[PDB]
Amino acid sequence: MIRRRKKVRKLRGSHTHGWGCKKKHRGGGSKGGRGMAGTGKRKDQKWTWTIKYAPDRLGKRGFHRPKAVQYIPKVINLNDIDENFELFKDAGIIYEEDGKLVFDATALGVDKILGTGKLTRALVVKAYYVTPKAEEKIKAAGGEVLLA
Amino acid sequence: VKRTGPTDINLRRLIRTLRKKSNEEGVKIWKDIAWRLERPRRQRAEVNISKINRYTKEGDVVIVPGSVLGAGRLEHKVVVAAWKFSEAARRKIIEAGGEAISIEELMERNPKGSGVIIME
RNA sequence: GAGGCGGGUCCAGCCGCGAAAGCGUGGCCUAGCGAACCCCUGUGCCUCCCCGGUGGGGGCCAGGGAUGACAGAAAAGCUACC
RNA sequence: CCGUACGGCUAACCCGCGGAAGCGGGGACAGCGGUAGGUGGGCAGUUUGGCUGGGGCGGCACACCCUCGAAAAGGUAUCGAG
RNA sequence: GUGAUCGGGUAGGCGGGCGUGCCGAUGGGGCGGAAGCCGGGCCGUGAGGUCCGGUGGACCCGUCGGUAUUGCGGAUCCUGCC
RNA sequence: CGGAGUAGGGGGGCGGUGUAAGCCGUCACCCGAGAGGGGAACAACCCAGACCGGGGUUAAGGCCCCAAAGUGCCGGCUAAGU
RNA sequence: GGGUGAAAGGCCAAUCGAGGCCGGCGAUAGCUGGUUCCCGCCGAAUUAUCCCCCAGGAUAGCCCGGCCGGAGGUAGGCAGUG
RNA sequence: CCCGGUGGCAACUAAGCCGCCUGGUGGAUGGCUCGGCUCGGGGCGCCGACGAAGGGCGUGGCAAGCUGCGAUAAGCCCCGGCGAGGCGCAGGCAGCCGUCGAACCGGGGAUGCCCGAAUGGGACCUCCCGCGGCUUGCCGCACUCCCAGUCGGGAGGGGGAACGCGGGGAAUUGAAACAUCUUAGUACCCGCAGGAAAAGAAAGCAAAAGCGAUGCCGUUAGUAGGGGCGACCGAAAGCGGCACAGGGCAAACUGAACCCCGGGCCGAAAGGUUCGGGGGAUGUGGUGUUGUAGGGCCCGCGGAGGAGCCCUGGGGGCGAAGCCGAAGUCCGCUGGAACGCGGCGCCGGAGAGGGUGAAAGCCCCGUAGGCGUAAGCCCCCGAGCUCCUGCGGUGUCCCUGAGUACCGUCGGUCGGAUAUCCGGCGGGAAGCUGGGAGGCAUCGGCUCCCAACCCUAAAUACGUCCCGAGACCGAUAGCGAACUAGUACCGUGAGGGAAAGCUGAAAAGCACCCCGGGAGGGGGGUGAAAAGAGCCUGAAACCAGGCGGCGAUAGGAGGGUGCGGCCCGAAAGGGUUGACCCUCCCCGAAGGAAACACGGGCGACCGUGGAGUACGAGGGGAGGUGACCGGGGUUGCACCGUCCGUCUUGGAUCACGGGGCAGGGAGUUCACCCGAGCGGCGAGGUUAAGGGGGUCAACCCCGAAGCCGCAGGGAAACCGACAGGUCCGCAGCCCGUAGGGCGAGGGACGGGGUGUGAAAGCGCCCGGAGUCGCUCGGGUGAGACCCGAAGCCGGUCGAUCUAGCCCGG
């Protein structure tokens, strides 16, 4: 696409290559120390930068639990049930029973139903947990919950 | 950095055509759309089906100076002109009774662009 | 442009003086002190690798312990061989 | 039960003289291994600040409050004055 | 078309052009004399381009698109010659 | 949103200090980063802010010769080359 | 970091207040020197706070380029309220 | 034609200055390349007491260096191939070998001095000195060890670029100082192996589900975690793939039923059988090898160990040096020579590359593609021959690895944190009614396993060698080395280390004459051309001569502007299809006269009219003339002008760098982050490693493991939202003639989720746009645009100088 040329090409004949006086483009003193030197904790040449742009880089806060104990559960919203109605039907998830149409947890395995969106249909929802607004919207659209 | 325009010559030709049509027919809309198509690519217009549904009614004609994407529903029939359509957006507009056409087709069918809604 | 420090205007709670309206978040106003990390105390909760107990450990909130070179290294000299 | 201090013994260990067997002397000490404290420029690595009518000694007006300097809004420096 | 209300410039930011070696394509030149070298003309603000004559004896250029050990007066610069 | 350079300033005017030269601040016209015309030459004093080729009029200042243009006009002073 | 020294820090292959060769090694420096073609458009700064800071750096102020947005703004003056 | 005296000239002078030409000096530029660099491929991958690598000395008819060889010495013998010349780099004089099959190529033998592990014993000089025994000619005689045994049979030592295993272990540096940390288990040192090595068959990983030896690739991840919690450091399981493989001891029970060496026999042999010896009851052989289990013993019913090995036989296949392999030298011109130009044909499963007197499908090698093959190797049919043997279960019967597991303490190491591994010291078990692990200790449950003994392919790493290829270099480049290069040369020594390519198609490499002591000069010759070995082209600086201009009364960094003199010309610039010059007519911007008539003023001067006339940059026309102009070199006159780069407030400075010329010479690459210019898909986007196909590094297809996003808040437990309710209003649209309405994007309200809190409030978030690429700008780390330290640390060399001491003079 747009293949522009590098600017060293235009700076042939500049004598300093954009860096100013002939004394300013040197080693680590010209950066104030290597890396995150001078950010505080012992020296303060870049402490003004630290207090404007990077607080909470120095210090500690909190604790982490082990992954062996961390559980991350899967969730789904009603907007998504409503907009994948047809795929969930073509594959197992949404199916019929004696009277009514029923949704089953077992797509990927979902512990919660969260209540963003709305519902245009009657549905018999199976879910280990369901949020109050979600239950109420299911009702207000003409369906029921049967926790498992 | 110099702001080149688009590299698709078909878009460049469309932009020239729009400007000329506005000078000829005596209107402002085609010019407006041209300067919106000549906007930088990282800032171009993107619109989902839900926005069109929210802001249109039965029998409306919409021009989008960019791409139309598919997320949400359309509960009536509309005529949408756009530079690009996604597969699902096209499918959903054809369902619901509407038509998904191009800006040249629209300028043929309505030279003045009377009644048209700009959506960006 | 600013961490920490200082001051101002209020909302609620529980209280004081006052007959009441009102005033009171120290000293008629402007000086009297201090980061990270670590520790001690108070307080009630969260947590420690398959599960459950006990001792012990970690975390959140508040107060305190110091850096006067006072936005904070733990620190004595000679060179006339240089 | 275990200890401490002392006294003695010889068979471990050490010293000497000897081709070696032994002999004589010391002796459960010393020496060897492991750990704990002290002393320790004998040997190493480092530090030993800044402002400053050059530097040094001097002095910390090296963090703060009030008046003047300060030019009738604001702002304004000197090893400037009190 | 407008410019009485545009026309200096260090550090520095931005835009367009000239030149060099190799690749994919395309158009071409060369023992009826290529590259290179010496001397002269014309165009171009210019970086530069091209023609004439001479010397030379075997390869070279234009345009589109890519790529790079890609442009020197100076470093008490390096190598060689004077 | 992104890319910088700049942390040694000076002339001139104002203020404090100092015998003074100077030191420390302040204004923000100039030099720095500014050609050309003048002051004998002059960073910042006067006129004046610069694409190229031509024709004219003025500015600062100047008109005995060096040197373009007055041995210019009227009234008065100086005798010290002042 | 050893020798040797009638002691001078003298001598150890033109090398000694810690030899010479190769290696770590293209060690590191806030200090010194250098940094290669053309034309156009814009165009600064040396001052405040912090740093073992004062020949260095960071956050702001002063330049450039691009985008958003959609009607007021303001370097001068007059009259007024303070 | 006489003289004498003048003012401008003339014109010729020397050194010197500028420029052009011809030569000298020098070796740039260009073109070329039997040499380098990089990537792929897996071809090949250890040598040595049967005396290596490395070194020294010799060796050719004339032979100095390199190369080759070893007193048989640029080579000796044999078997196959090829098919006539050959005698190394290396273009000579003399000769020899070869058709009785050479040179060359493949395979195999012989000879093979001295030193060197160096080994009969010694080395201040890669040379010396001995023992035996057999007959000068011959074999044997080192140290350490095993088997032995007074005889003998065996092993080891040294070498190897990179890759491999095990130990010992710094400082520079960064942290803008520095001590924990970092640099770093790095550099360097010691030991030990191979063509690969190491690892390897759960006393494991996990967690309500399960997996199933090791090693490698991609992710997991800059995550868990460590850390003056600073700078910085830093995994694994799991998931997706490549490749696959499992076997044996100790013991319980048995108790010589066993192994090795030599000789006598049989055999192709696998291996049998005999005498004589060495081992072994301190146990050779048989058995047997695992989780609440396996094995042994004990009862018993069953008795397919038969898989391997030897090759008289046998077929196939791989596998050579090596073979075959199409089609114009057709006719004219140019030229020294066609591979050129023009014309006329042909082959093609071959138009890749190269060579040949210029640019060649058809002249030659080759190429596409067909061929054959001895040894050597694989496959199987047959050939002769071997050592123990299953299944089902009962049992108060036996067994299953000790200074080990485990505790405490010290040192090191690790991401391993009260929870990594290693070692030392002090303690120290159970042992099948048993033992271990599950991230502080301990108690109880549940889950998974059986240590303290041994072997093991494939997938992987490397390239001192070979093969192929290339947006790599093209002789100051590229490896240091395109070549008699790790060579010449320097240093006591460790050690340091260059320069140097090109005649021509063919030597046809100058016969002959004059001069010169000679090197040589001059005439003549070869050749298309001197291109003459001081050899392709042959630049600049510098030097000599010739030509032109200036040149001894003269003042500025060597130049700029304007006006002149002397000289020269190509025609690429122009011009008789009209150069230059002379005169007249028309229009004419801004600007703008004088003479002259009157008047004002003491005056220098002014006003009025002349007159906006005459002029005036320039824009057009008409006639006279008949040949230069533009340019270039040098120089005169007048006016102007204190060099270049650099820091610096300030440079002509008595501030720094600056004799001349040519070639070389400085913002690169990777990883992560922030932005942009474009492009693809889009509530989804994108493949990595790898795999399959093909015309085989290009191309096409598969492969979502993972990553970002789609829902956040919170230290954590945990909880878990507007796909539009109201208004203002830019573009734009509608009605109209200003005004009036609708209004995406944008803005403001309102409402929701969560943390805090008694709550109210406040923070963060909520009405669908991200993700993958290419290029550019920037930040951070790495040598990080380029050059420059004093010094710090490691291992080695040196007392022929000099200081000290001993022995002999």
The answer to whether the beta carbon of residue A60 comes closer than 7 angstroms to any atom of strand C is yes
Tell if A77 CB is < 7 Å from nucleic strand H: yes
Q: What residues of B are in contact with residue A2 (Cβ under 8 Å)?
A: 4, 7
Q: How far is B72 from chain A (nearest CA, A)?
A: 8
* Strands ordered across the beta sheet of A129-130: A75-77, A112-114, A129-130
Q: Return chain A residues 37..56 having CB < 7 Å to nucleic acid strand C.
A: 40-44, 47-48, 51-52, 55
Closest CA of chain A from B71, distance in Å? 9
Nearest to A129 by CA among A106, A108, A146, A107: A146
Q: How far off is chain B from A119, nearest CA to CA, in Å?
A: 13
Q: Which amino acid is at B50?
A: S
Determine the distance in angstroms separating the CA of A2 from the nearest CA of chain B, rounded to an integer: 8
Residue A85 neighbours by CB under 8 Å, 6+ apart: A94, A121
Residues of A in contact with B7 (CB under 8 A): 1-2
Report how far residue B116's alpha carbon sits from residue B112's, in angstroms, rounded to the nearest whole number: 9
Q: What sign does the CA torsion over A15, A16, A18, A20 have?
A: negative
Closest residue of chain B to A83, computed from CA coordinates:
B72
Q: Report whether B117 contacts B62 (CB < 8 A).
A: yes
Handedness of CA B110, B113, B115, B116 (dihedral sign): positive
Residues 13-52 of A with CB under 7 A from strand H: 15-19, 21-22, 25-29, 31-39, 41-43, 45
Q: Is the CB of A4 under 7 A from strand H?
A: yes
Are the C-beta atoms of A93 and A107 separated by less than 8 Å?
yes
Q: How far is the CA of B86 from the C1' of F73 (A)?
A: 100
Tokens 């909470």 locate to: A56
Q: Does B10 touch chain A (CB under 8 A)?
A: no
The DSSP letter of residue A106 is: T
Q: For strands B60-69 and B78-85, give the pairing.
A: parallel
Rounded to the nearest angstrom, the gap between the alpha carbon of residue A143 and the centroid of all alpha carbons in its chain is 32
Nearest to B66, CA basis, from B1, B24, B10, B119: B119
A33: CB partners within 8 A, 6+ apart = A43, A45, A46
DSSP assignments along B25-90, one per residue:
HT-SHHHHHHHHHTS-GGG--EEEHHHHHHH--TTEEEEEEEEEE--S---S-EEEEEEEE-HHHH
Give the residues across from A145 on adjacent strands.
Answer: A125
Residues A146, A107 contacting (CB under 8 angstroms):
no
In 3D space, the residue among B114, B3, B18, B2 whose CA is nearest the CA of residue B65 turns out to be B18
β-sheet bridge partners, residue A130:
A113
Distance A14 CA to E74 C1' (A): 15
**A-B contacts at Cβ under 8 angstroms:** 3
Angle between helix axes B9-25 and B29-37 (nearest 10 degrees) is: 160
Experimental method: cryo-EM
